[PDB]
Amino acid sequence: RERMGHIELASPTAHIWFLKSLPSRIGLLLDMPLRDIERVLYFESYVVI
Amino acid sequence: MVYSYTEKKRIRKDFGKRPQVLDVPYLLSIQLDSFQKFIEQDPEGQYGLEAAFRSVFPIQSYSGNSELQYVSYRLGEPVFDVQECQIRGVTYSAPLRVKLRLVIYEREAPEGTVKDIKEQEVYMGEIPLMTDNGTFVINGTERVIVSQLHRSPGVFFDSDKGKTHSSGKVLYNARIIPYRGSWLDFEFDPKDNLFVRIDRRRKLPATIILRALNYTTEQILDLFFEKVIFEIRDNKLQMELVPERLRGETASFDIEANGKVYVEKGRRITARHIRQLEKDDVKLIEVPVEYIAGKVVAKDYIDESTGELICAANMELSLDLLAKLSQSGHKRIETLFTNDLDHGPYISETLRVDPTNDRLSALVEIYRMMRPGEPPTREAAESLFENLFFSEDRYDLSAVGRMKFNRSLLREEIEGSGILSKDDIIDVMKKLIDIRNGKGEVDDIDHLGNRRIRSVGEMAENQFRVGLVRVERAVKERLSLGDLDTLMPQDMINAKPISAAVKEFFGSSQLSQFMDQNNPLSEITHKRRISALGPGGLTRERAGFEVRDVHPTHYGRVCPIETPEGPNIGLINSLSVYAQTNEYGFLETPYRKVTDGVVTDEIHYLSAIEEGNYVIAQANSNLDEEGHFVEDLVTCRSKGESSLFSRDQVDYMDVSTQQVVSVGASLIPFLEHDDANRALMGANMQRQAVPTLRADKPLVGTGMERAVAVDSGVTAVAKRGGVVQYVDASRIVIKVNEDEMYPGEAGIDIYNLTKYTRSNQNTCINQMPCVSLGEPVERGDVLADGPSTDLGELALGQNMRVAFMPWNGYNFEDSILVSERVVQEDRFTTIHIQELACVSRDTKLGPEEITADIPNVGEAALSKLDESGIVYIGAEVTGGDILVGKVTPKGETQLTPEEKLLRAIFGEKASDVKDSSLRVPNGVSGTVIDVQVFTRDGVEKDKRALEIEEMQLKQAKKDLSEELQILEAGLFSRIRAVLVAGGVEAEKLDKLPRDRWLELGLTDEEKQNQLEQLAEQYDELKHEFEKKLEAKRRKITQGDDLAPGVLKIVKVYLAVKRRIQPGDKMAGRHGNKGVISKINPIEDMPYDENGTPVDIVLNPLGVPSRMNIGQILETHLGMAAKGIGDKINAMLKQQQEVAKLREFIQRAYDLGADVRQKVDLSTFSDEEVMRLAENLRKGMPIATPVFDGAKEAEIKELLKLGDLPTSGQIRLYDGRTGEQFERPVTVGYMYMLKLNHLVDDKMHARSTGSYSLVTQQPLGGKAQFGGQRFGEMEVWALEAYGAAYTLQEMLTVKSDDVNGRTKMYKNIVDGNHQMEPGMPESFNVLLKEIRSLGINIELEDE
Amino acid sequence: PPDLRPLVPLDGGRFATSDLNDLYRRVINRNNRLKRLLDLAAPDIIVRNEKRMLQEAVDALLDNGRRGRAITGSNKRPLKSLADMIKGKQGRFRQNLLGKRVDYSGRSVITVGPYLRLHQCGLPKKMALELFKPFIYGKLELRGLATTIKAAKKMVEREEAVVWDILDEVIREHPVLLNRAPTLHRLGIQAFEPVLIEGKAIQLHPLVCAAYNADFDGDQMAVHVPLTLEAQLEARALMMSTNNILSPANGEPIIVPSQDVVLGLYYMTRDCVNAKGEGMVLTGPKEAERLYRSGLASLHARVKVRITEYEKDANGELVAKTSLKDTTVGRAILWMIVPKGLPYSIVNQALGKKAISKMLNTCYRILGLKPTVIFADQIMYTGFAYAARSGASVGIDDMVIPEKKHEIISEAEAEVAEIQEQFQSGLVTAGERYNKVIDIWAAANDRVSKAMMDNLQTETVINRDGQEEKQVSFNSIYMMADSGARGSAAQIRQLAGMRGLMAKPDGSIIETPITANFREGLNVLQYFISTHGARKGLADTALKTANSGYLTRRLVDVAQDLVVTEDDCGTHEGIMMTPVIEGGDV
DNA sequence: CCGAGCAGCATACATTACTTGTGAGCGGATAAC
DNA sequence: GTTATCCGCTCACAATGCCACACGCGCTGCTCGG
Ligand SMILES: [Mg+2]
């Protein structure tokens, strides 16, 4: 009833709460419109760093 | 004289003056009819299976020139019988086969085929038939599919009354809904811009779709406006004028014409001058060129040689551009007619906002809108738009819907295509634009003219077509990839999806549900019940306070008084008594045709709108026996309202008073004396009634009881009249007369009266035979009363002697105090039957066996069972005992084959025992009455199974043997008649038995041929009956379908003679519910001066608040009925002569003022009068129609017939003291029901026990032995008081903190009420759930 | 953790897969496949799409809401994500944390049981024997009647003749909690002392059942047993019925004798002008009681009775002033219940319902609390007693119709007829015509109502030693009304007199009203319109219940913090309370 | 050669579906310097 | 033109409590199996 498990994700992944909970935490934290953030999370864009 | 043999037993005295003209129709007429239009081979292709078939067929390949089609279909008779299907636990399915012809157009060649393959009768699943009572015997249970009331497909125009934009600019939207497709609609933006929308997509300025249909700006502007011409004459541009145009609004200058001046240079031309202009017939008006400012031109004008366009189509106009263009022509300047009130400029604004310009741009715009992000080609968008509509398959208007549409636009041709059309779209647009202007009018949705019912057949064929289109796709792709000519049309299609769809519908539907089968009335009202929920229908969440309210057109088409109280009022509705679905699907009600002045007895059925046309009279309009209203300003209803009208103004009378209410409310005597708010709960309580031991007629009925009993199923009604040959307590055997019989089938027919059998509400059903032995019966007469039925009359409760007076508060608020005499006579003791099923799996660890021995329990727990391991039929078990009888393979993973060899022969069945045996649940006692055993074929048998199968075999064999006996009797009569008419055989065929008959001999020549005939047909018949006995025996002892790893389902039944007790819930028939409070001793109830006590004593303070005086009136009439009965009892105690008793009864039957029935009491046999009187010993049953009830004066006269006081009030006496109550109290005989809210289903408590495993809390539910739930509001209350410690202990140590609660237990058994609380494991579960998310939540250190 | 998402089994091996395991399997499967792809040279677009799919699956697991759905196989419904196990009416908060199911309780259906005292409450033997089981085990261990716990379980299983004595002992003062299903306000849960009864019903005092807003239509009630000592004493001190006698909302008394006793007392306090026994002198109330029970004097006849009404001249004293007041036998009998406090003027009146509330209020004001609860219980007892002894009974011939109703209705009919003719004669606009029609109809309705009232309330014209005298009616109806026992005159006139106008579904008012009444017949149209109104009302109730529930739930979760901590904030700013004046009266 | 487990599948599609009432972030039109 | 301003567009997010009862709860063609 107590012990928890963990999954070593084979690649990083977003946390659906902080992405789609108005106002999106990531959006305000990055000064980036949420639409572009969604378009780059789901692999249909690019972002220069 | 018109009364059947059933009626002549107890003919109910009938009040009511209105002469009924139309007998109440077959109550279930909806359901069967529905399934009829679903199951018969309709050659018109309009509806039924044919409809779905011809909609999906003919399929083809990927245009691969290989087609499938159906020739016709058929339905083999079901393999089982409705009783056998219901008891064995299998649907009452019917195989469905169809003639599939497959053509293969070889390539390359034109239309033609050398490769044809004709595979008939392919087995595409089985469909559940509808029994002759409208139900659907699905596996085990008996479902009923309610009809669903919903928006009719078509078009309608809603106002959207200002709820948006807070502007009072009400924006009339208009929508078109198909039957199978994507609906469409238009809206007026608050900027007066039309906006087209597909079902729910991004809004689009409507005019775009116009270009989507080969329509340029020119045609679009032409089809929406009036061309005001401007002819450039020698000067002044004399445009053509119609007076109402300039009538309009403010004028600007003088409008002189033909020399004279007709309107000065003023403003807002007065109607007088406009009429004067109409007189003068002006065809042209000299106007200044400056006036044309807005005036956007329609025709697209170009220059004569420069190629370019000097005047586009619907761009604008302006003086500069006008002088710029008129240097080429002109002679015909066609502009649009604009006006802010009529012919409003609502299309020009749209074409302004319209971004596109060309048809292909329209296609690409609609294509992007439908599904964004796709490469728009010509073919892609074009095919998408030609599939959105204009496609027989992807869309259909449901010719009923085509009628609704085609009529809502005032067109004439009712018939029409089932597909949209450009003219239809532009007509809808024109209608909507008119709605934005003055003319035209919006139409509400709750009006029955727009809400159609959808029966079982229609929804069934809908689901069938849905399940069919997917197998169509599958067979198309398989025909594509698969070979052209090698196959046989029996495997490219699979019955799996068809069966899956139809079975998931009939079994697990939002609409279908197990029948409310605890009462005949409940059964009926649940069959003819109209719902508004379900697929394609609204839900109770988004219902809205508007829909539930009754619309003035509900009168006669749907009952307004019967509807479930609570979260769904008005959604669920009971269909009216005389109501009847239309050909298209609307609710048409009968009406009496009124000629000029006379009221005919002819009837017409009318829908909502047809009735709205005429003016309808009323049934309470007292006639004059010749079609004439004795009044003049008769009340009437013309257009959804009530008003007075003269005698020569009506056009249709109501058929009968009862047509306003449902069959449910129809059973409420003196209904019109009750508040609707009470009659609702009255009907609803009447539905939930419960059958008793000795059902008995209700003294005050409404005549509808005979019809509702005989039209339901619970009664075993005779098929063909004749003589009752043999009656028993379980079987009936009738010998039909010589007229209604066939060549074979000597005439006997058998009715197996279903004895005590479970129901979907765990209450008993039973058909005791009502007819005696040898009494002749006619066609369609009740031969066995069902549950809560008496002599073919619906009889739910009992006629209890009640009195209205407070009794020491034992009936304080609404309670009820009864007499122990009611308990002693078992007037209310019901029977409760419940089943318990034990399954025998086949675990991969090992199979399941039902052996008698149990490894652990003592002798007691194995005493009830038999040698096989099942209880005997009769052991009065109690909660905890063992019904079966089952052991399981417990252990696993030893893997010592040196011991496996031991326990494979020496311990073959003593290795891994475990007593997972079916015990009766804790609390439920009773008697075991029946045991069914379903054994999976292959699994060998059990002794009890063999015994029950042999018993069933014997029962079946008895019928065939009795039929064989009657056939042999006829055949030996034939032989003896042949072997006596010559020979001669005189003292042989009487003394000599059947031993040597089939081998004797008369003279050979022809009589030996007679012997050949009548002695070879003998053994031919014998062989035939042997064949059919073998067939029945096969059906009895064949396999049983138990799919997912199960071997033997053993079902055991338990019966309880559930008595009455303080705590049950009883009610009359007027919503006067109440909890029974005390079984007061008989010597304490109030009692009349004649020593008779009173059974029930109600509370009078319940009448004046809940204003339903009807019951009291009923009660009065009750004491009338019993009165007569009492008097008759006198005539029956002393053996009074039959003539005198007949005379008295005859005086009784004709007491009303002017009653509809006139029985004579003559032409009744001097002994049939005696049987009738004996049936009337317990009181004269009285029929009072719903809205033709007996007035109080008739009740006074009836009481005067007896020796009872007219006031209906008698000086009582307190059984305790012995002194009389002053103020003589009311006492009568009221009918009283009993509801299955009985106390033994609610009272239970929980000290300790099991707990939920995910959250360590006690379970919820009486069955799970769980405890009550302390809810939010309970906690808020508990903490409202300063009950800190109470709330704390109720939170932690009562329900959670497993260590804390075990400590509390161990500490409270030790006489110390101190708690050691902690952290409720529910909270730790919450911690672990949040922590399972990315969130980190901790308990702070300090 | 695994246990919190348990794979619950079935009778065979058909383990019901909790959707959490399904989501986790989906995600871990994406992860394993993606790792395997990462190892095999990673075709770039392939691994791209695979990471996208894994992101989608993880999003669905954390919340199935956004990004479409993740529907289970062949069961067209979304899967409970983690958030779905926290939010909503089934989330852990509103489902298990805030309100958790209790293992130590029970429920049943409530009868009346009008004999028990105000703090007592009925309890079925079965329910008590099931609830107090641990206490019974403890008591048995004490008396040594069963040394082992399993022996005591067996003894309770057999219900030996000693276990009932034990149970009766163990609850002699042990309180208990009774609760109604919708617990709207604080009184929805009260504390009583149980009394063992038979059957399975739960008796409860009628007054508190008027407080629970509990009828006897079969409404069920839940029981609870406070087991720790703190909780027992807390229920005894705080939520015992003899503590809650004023609503926390208004300082009005919640213990109001509702019906069936106000009728009783009202009948006991009236005055027939010529009743058997009128004109005597009684040496006291007990004398009148004996004179009545012996069947010599009517329950209500004017007499001269000596009465000793006590008083409190100085604070604490109780003087007695033995007066000789003109009264009736009934009032004198009732005087044997007032507890040495209130003056005689509290009884001498007709003593309807508002009068009973006033009497109880002034008794709580003068004498304190304990004599007031005893006095209220005595009132309830005597009210039921003499109500039964009265035999109040409504018959069909009780409700009368005034002999002008037919005439008034015919006259108003002539009026509306000539008005409508005037309209069709072009003398008044249709709207003002409608207005005139509804106006004359309402006027005729008021006429009929007043006529019915003036004929019913005083039809009793009796004579004493001579000619004739009028008096307030003795009709059963209007005795259930004038006393305020049940129903108002508005419902009476809607029963005997004309039913009046009725309302369209939209809210407008039909021209032609329901000229008929309940005692007479109702035509089909009239019943139809009444049904319009009734269904409007019922739908309104069925929606307002849920809406008000949501409202109060929002309320209690914005003020749930307020607790009075400080004893004196020490400020000077308040509001200027002034009597409200809407323009008319105050 | 079909019976008994499995792995990732909106069944592939056009599924689909009127108003629910309210707040709140957001993108195209808008006034001003 | 731009910079800040505002207004309609679309999406998230709530829907009384209990009680009881009922019903159901993947599959399926690929995969492991003889
Ligand atoms: Mg209630």
Swiss-Prot record, chain B:
GO molecular function: DNA binding; DNA-directed RNA polymerase activity; ribonucleoside binding
Superkingdom of this protein's organism: Bacteria
Residues bearing the modification N6-acetyllysine: 1022, 1200
Alphabetical list of Gene3D superfamilies matching this protein: 2.40.50.100, 2.40.50.150, 3.90.1100.10, 6.10.140.1670, DNA-directed RNA polymerase, beta subunit, external 1 domain, DNA-directed RNA polymerase, subunit 2, domain 6, RNA polymerase alpha subunit dimerisation domain, RNA polymerase Rpb2, domain 2
Reaction(s) catalysed (UniProt annotation): RNA(n) + a ribonucleoside 5'-triphosphate = RNA(n+1) + diphosphate
Record-linked HAMAP family: RNApol_bact_RpoB (MF_01321)
Record-stated family: Belongs to the RNA polymerase beta chain family.
Cross-referenced NCBIfam families: PRK00405.1, rpoB
Protein name (Swiss-Prot/TrEMBL): DNA-directed RNA polymerase subunit beta
Originating gene: rpoB
